[PDB]
Amino acid sequence: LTPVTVIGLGAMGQALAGAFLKAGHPTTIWNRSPGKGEDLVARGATRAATPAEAVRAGEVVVVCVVDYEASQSILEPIAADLAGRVLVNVTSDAPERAREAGEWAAEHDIAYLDGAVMIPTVMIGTPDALLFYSGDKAAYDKHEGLLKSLGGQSAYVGADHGLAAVYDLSMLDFLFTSMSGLVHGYALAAKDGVPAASIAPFLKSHISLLSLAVEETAKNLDEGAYPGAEANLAMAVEGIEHILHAAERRGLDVSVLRGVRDVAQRAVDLGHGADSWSATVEGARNPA
Amino acid sequence: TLTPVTVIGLGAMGQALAGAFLKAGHPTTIWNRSPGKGEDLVARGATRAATPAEAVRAGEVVVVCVVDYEASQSILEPIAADLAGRVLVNVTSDAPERAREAGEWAAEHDIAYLDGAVMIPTVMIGTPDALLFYSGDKAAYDKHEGLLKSLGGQSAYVGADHGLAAVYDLSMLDFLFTSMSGLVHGYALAAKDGVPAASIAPFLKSHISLLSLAVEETAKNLDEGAYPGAEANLAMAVEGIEHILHAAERRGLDVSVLRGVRDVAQRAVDLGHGADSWSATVEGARNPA
């Protein structure tokens, strides 16, 4: 039963440590700020007094903090104590930061997986939870059972240390932008006296539509073909402008809709008014 | 015999509506401003009218589906005399203000009026996955419910206010178009590092599932004014968005949408919500600087 260490006792670090304990792994925890995660110690975790003590207690060291400025500020002073252990950083950040961390790990003889948690804390430790990994495949295979205690959908995506961050940020781009639009549409409805509870059942239709659009948009963008006969971009721009101006008249922030509209109109300017929404990729890639 | 219907507008959606009326056996008359559209509807049995006046005279119910209300009212106003008596159904997507103006005009001309919206793509018209909203004259909706239900399983009359369907429509399209922008953007980000969209797509089901539950939870949070952030705080999410925005900008992508996403979230943090959940961003949307 491989001993593991969790660096970071924010919401997600605590979830990761809890899943390791539930799976029966000896678990050691550490956080910059004191007093967090009381229940983890009640569940059997050892609380380390220093970062070096923490890493020396784990054959695998899992880091989950807010950014790589934070993670590397913790890890750089203790590089010598990471020798012979597998370092796994699941902090969400840019591929450039993951690649820099990977170069530093290689310099110090530290087996390295750079990863990402793609689901909320309550899903950690369940079969459906998705986590990405990239880097040392031998280390991933050796500790696959340990890692799968965090989520059944653990997905290794390649040896390049930035690849997990590519998949992570691309998906979060979609997710956060979508969550912004969800809040915004409910805010628009509320301005006109419609509670969100009345809109929510109908949005199931747009969730189903998004599932179809995931596949079609992927094929269109990979191909560079944007067939618009059944729904053209010029029509969509007019539709978006109606939303934009309605929300503006109601005193809502419309920075997001203005961006949606501007990127779409840019693609129209580039010749894509008869193409589908997928042609907006041309406006995103070729801004004015 | 079956109720005769007229479709005004032979763009993509008008053609789909006319095709569904034909499939159900309704006599169907069609008209479009520009020539040469919808000839396959004529082959399937539709009658092409030469003018909008002739088109409406052939229908007990008149269904309009054009690009905006500037367009629809420019067609309908000159033919008010021929519309009197008939039921007018406008499913063009536009602002509630335009729908209320059109409903007032119809009422002042003794035209029974439904204002509606098509919420799904053309392939779903005539199927159980169709969703259309209607608001306005309940008596006309009830009389012609069977005709309207030939378009789609979910045919939802929402209330008397002529602008109410438009509120439901634009609120949902706000979500849909914003989400579609993010889907294109995320795939574009992946491609900048050589990752095809086909490689990202299989994993997006995880986030569609998240969004499916967020639809319900976010609705409750906003209706209640409760934004519990213990398990995912807004300050953490702002940093996450920053990383996406910088990664994308450094790869040469337009980041206007992410900048807006971040700015509304940051405004909510500035209003005291850094420990609350993403739902607290409604306060930034409502109280811009």
Ligand SMILES: NC(=O)c1ccc[n+]([C@@H]2O[C@H](COP(=O)([O-])OP(=O)(O)OC[C@H]3O[C@@H](n4cnc5c(N)ncnc54)[C@H](OP(=O)(O)O)[C@@H]3O)[C@@H](O)[C@H]2O)c1
């Ligand atoms: N639902 C979720 O919560 C969720 C889901 C998927 C992914 N994630 C990812 O998980 C990561 C952690 O997020 P979280 O939700 O756990 O955030 P959180 O609850 O805000 O925790 C932030 C963590 O980072 C630490 N930290 C920040 N700056 C630091 C510094 N300069 N030095 C040392 N430690 C520092 C904090 O330590 P202190 O306690 O000392 O501040 C804490 O342990 C993020 O990358 C996030 O995107 C989270």
Ligand SMILES: NC(=O)c1ccc[n+]([C@@H]2O[C@H](COP(=O)([O-])OP(=O)(O)OC[C@H]3O[C@@H](n4cnc5c(N)ncnc54)[C@H](OP(=O)(O)O)[C@@H]3O)[C@@H](O)[C@H]2O)c1
């Ligand atoms: N396509 C979809 O997936 C979809 C889904 C849901 C809702 N809708 C809604 O359906 C409505 C129609 O969209 P669509 O996809 O059919 O658009 P489209 O294919 O671009 O067709 C536009 C229609 O409007 C007409 N039009 C434009 N300006 C006009 C004017 N000044 N006078 C008269 N006619 C005018 C066009 O006639 P000409 O041929 O003479 O230009 C055509 O019939 C929009 O409100 C849209 O949001 C569409």
